[PDB]
Amino acid sequence: EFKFLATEAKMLITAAERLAGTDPRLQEMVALIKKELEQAERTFRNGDKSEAQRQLEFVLTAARAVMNVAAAANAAGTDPLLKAMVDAILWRLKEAIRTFQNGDEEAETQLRFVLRAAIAVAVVAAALVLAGTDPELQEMVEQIKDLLISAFMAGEKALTQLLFVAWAAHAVAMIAAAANLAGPRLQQQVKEILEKLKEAIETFQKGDEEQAFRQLAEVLAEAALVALRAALTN
Amino acid sequence: EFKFLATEAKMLITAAERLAGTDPRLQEMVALIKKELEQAERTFRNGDKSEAQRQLEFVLTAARAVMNVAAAANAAGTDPLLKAMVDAILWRLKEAIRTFQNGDEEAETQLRFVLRAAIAVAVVAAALVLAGTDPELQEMVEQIKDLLISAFMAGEKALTQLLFVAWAAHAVAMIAAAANLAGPRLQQQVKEILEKLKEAIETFQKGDEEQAFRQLAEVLAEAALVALRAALTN
Amino acid sequence: STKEKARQLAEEAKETAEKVGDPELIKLAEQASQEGDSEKAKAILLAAEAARVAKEVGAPDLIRLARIAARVGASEAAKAILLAAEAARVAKEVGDPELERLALLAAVLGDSEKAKAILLAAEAARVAKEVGDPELIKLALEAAERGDSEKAKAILLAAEAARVAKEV
Amino acid sequence: GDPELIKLALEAARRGDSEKAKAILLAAEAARVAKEVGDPELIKLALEAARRGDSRKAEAILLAAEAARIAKEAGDPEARKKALEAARRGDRELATRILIEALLRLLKKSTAELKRATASLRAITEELKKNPSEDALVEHNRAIVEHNAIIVENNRIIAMVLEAIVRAI
Amino acid sequence: STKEKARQLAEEAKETAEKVGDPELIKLAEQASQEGDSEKAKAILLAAEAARVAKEVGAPDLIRLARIAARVGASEAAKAILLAAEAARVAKEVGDPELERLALLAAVLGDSEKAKAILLAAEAARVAKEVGDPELIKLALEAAERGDSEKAKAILLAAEAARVAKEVGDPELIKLALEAARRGDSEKAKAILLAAEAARVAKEVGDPELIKLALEAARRGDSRKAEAILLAAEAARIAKEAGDPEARKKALEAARRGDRELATRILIEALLRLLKKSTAELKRATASLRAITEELKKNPSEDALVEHNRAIVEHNAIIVENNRIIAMVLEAIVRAI
């Protein structure tokens, strides 16, 4: 609840404070959230229980996206485009935090997507960090990042697009983690799920919203099923 | 929205249909959700736009928990306690789906926790699937599973407990994935985050709600930071 | 009389736990006695009886379930584990794995109603296999999947009625 | 050994309440039956009735204790549990019905045992008939006495069941 | 369920007809089954039973009467023929020809009320001949000629009350029985019978207050008070057999009160005490039988086998006595319940 699911937000704040050791914008956002967490806990201690619940729900998404940004910064310490999009999401998050602090309604509108934005951002960051010599789709992942930048511009045309990008990253991050612990059965199994993933991405880049999303989700599911065996192959 | 974030639910339904190839209870729940998705889309096409949004929000959590259950079944095909808790969550999900279909209000009450229940369930399932020879904490993970079963009984005393169990699994799943792609710097780095994780778990099993949650979250954050380097160590 | 009843039911809980093979539930029962919670005491007692009936049946799922229920002091979960261990014994006598799944699920959900449903459904399946009533076994399986104690008892009584009819 | 029952008896004597004293007597009897059987819930209900002074609840607890004793003598732990539930409920009709069911089961068992004893006595008689001697007459008379003792035991069980029915009716 | 019940009762009708010696009634019953008349089926059944009871008695009048009743399907006439064949058997046991005439007339008129009247009147004449009550036999003959089942049952109960009085020696009870026979009050006659039984129990025990209450009830005609006095007398008899004079006094108090519930409760308590005593005696007898068995085992001989068999027979007799006591207690509970 407003103080019984804010202990989960408190563990999230403790994780982010220990996972955002750089980007002082991240530390400042964590401090503004803890103050917003403090403001909600005071409203949770005050008679403003519904306002407490609303502020706590906003700060929960805030802490979730902040953890996404911190994990991205930890997983994208070498990608300049990723650091740029991360600082951009940090500025957008400060703007959305000022808007919600202004009672703006439109808080869970851009941050509604900026939450998914930080999700896909940490997704691409993990895809790059768990990569190695042969990314083989980091260009596509950069294209997706471009599509994410495009989603950064498509934020209304990015609600399902952010989900599709995250699912494609998951099919890539599953394949990336499989190839990471591989020295080649896991690589061959991920080469077939990555095939359907790239086919759907071209279809998702062909204006296919349901069919390409379904194909990418099925490719990700098959990749996760093969990862269940690849995790015992080493 | 009620039809602009239901395309994301549609990609979720496509993933779950391709990720729940066993447990016909999972296929039946996916079918009831798609019918509930169809009912909301009809209400989204009808003048019942607020009812459409409510049913779509319920079905979104339903599809999320169903994907959690499918990924668990894919990651817990060998744990009888996990399969038992999975069938139990499937029965609880059918009950909550009948309750929400009855307009029961108490839908996002047990399913509110049953969503977190499926979250922690898929978490423990991934912890077991990405494990290998030396689990070294699968007993603790089973204890956590017991604590999850206890959470399965503590569902009111499990709202923050489910979050804590998921965070401890994440600190374990990070360490598990690090040791998976390791042949031992990543193992030594995860041995120190796992130390604080077990210390907090004993503290979390010592009735420590804020301190133990904070320690486990910080251990998970440090483990994720070390995983950023461990992902490039192979 | 609350603290005295708590100490007594918790001593019985620890005894039935040691007899079940649970020294952990025995210690949790000693703690329920020291705290003076008759609810937690009877919970550890029902969980110890559940673990005994499980050791008689042979399911470590309900065993650990009753262990955790005693460690926490869950009376509903302990009664569910006890009725589910009874269901597991009745199923091992019958031989229905879906019934065992439903019983373990009732023990995990702590639904003592669903646990009595699984017990009556295992009894119904046994009575149907003894009588040869496939409709009774189908109703028993449906009640076990649904967790309806009334439907499972009805399937049991219908299998018994079919047995009495075939004998008559 | 029920000091709560003795205290209730002394309190009833000081109060002059023959009803409370009879309730204390019935509670002491129920506690004695619980101690002899091992039903701590029954002894607890007996002490609670002695503290309360409910001769009806105490008599119901005593009936349930006798029923659970007959169950332990037979081996019906479900009957003992139902007796505990009825004594916690405080009614004696269900306790008497459970005692009757347990006595019926024990009577079927004693009837099987008596049929076996009669068959054994007839066999010993046929053995003494085919070759009578010291050992033959000894075994025949011993089998006759064993059948008489088994009949006496079955009659004692029937008498206990009838006394239970009388205390119930 | 009408056609099925018809076929079943008609098959039973044909069977009891063939057993009675009637293949014609058997065919009429088969016809009642084929038609599906449960009334005609039960009619042929009662007529077949009537013909059986007549072949047992020996009257071709009621035999042909039941034959025609089955051929037609007359349920009232069949029941009349059955009760009249019962009356004819009771009369052949008694020996009254006017009773036989009245029974045949009830069978012919088909008056099942008059047939039960003839049955009760033949029973009354038999009970009067056994007791020696000419007023009872006169009332029985009057009821048979009149066809009054109440009067015939009253004559029977009055003859029984006079028999119980003569066996007890209660001339007040015999006078009450004669007065009930003259009045035709079966209730008063049954009260006189219960009072004579209570007075017999009082004389056999020695409870003059019980015999006094029995005479008072006989003069009053209260079957409830008389039955309560009889229950209290049996309870006091069991008490004297046990040695509970307080129980006998409580029985006297309850009989003076006129209720039988307290009398039955006291009889139950006395039977419980006597049962505990008989249980102790049976345990002692079983121990003695086991001891005689061990003695015959240690040194078997003529005297050893003799003593072992005698102890076995003594244990069997003690068990028979305890079972008789238990049976008396159970009969008391049954008369009370």
Residue numbers in the entry:
A (entry chain 1), B (entry chain R): 1 to 234
C (entry chain Q): 1 to 168
D (entry chain K): 169 to 337
E (entry chain Y): 1 to 337
In the authors' words:
To investigate the photophysics of special pairs independently of the complexities of native photosynthetic proteins, and as a first step toward creating synthetic photosystems for new energy conversion technologies, we designed C2-symmetric proteins that hold two chlorophyll molecules in closely juxtaposed arrangements. For Chl dimer protein scaffolds, we chose hyperstable C2-symmetric repeat protein dimers containing symmetric pockets with tunable sizes and geometries. In this dimeric repeat protein architecture, the hydrophobic core is independent of the small molecule-binding site, enabling full customization for binding with little impact on the overall protein structure.
Twenty-one designs were experimentally characterized, and one was found to assemble into octahedral structures by negative-stain EM. In this nanocage, the SP2-like component shares 87% sequence identity with the original SP2 design and its absorbance spectrum had a red-shifted shoulder in the Qy region, similar to the original SP2−ZnPPaM complex. The cryo-EM structure of the 600-kDa octahedral nanocage with 24 ZnPPaM molecules bound to it was solved to 6.5 Å resolution, with the helices well resolved. The cryo-EM structure is very similar to the computational design model in both the protein−protein interfaces and the overall architecture. The asymmetric unit of the cryo-EM structure agrees with the design model to 3.4 Å backbone r.m.s.d.
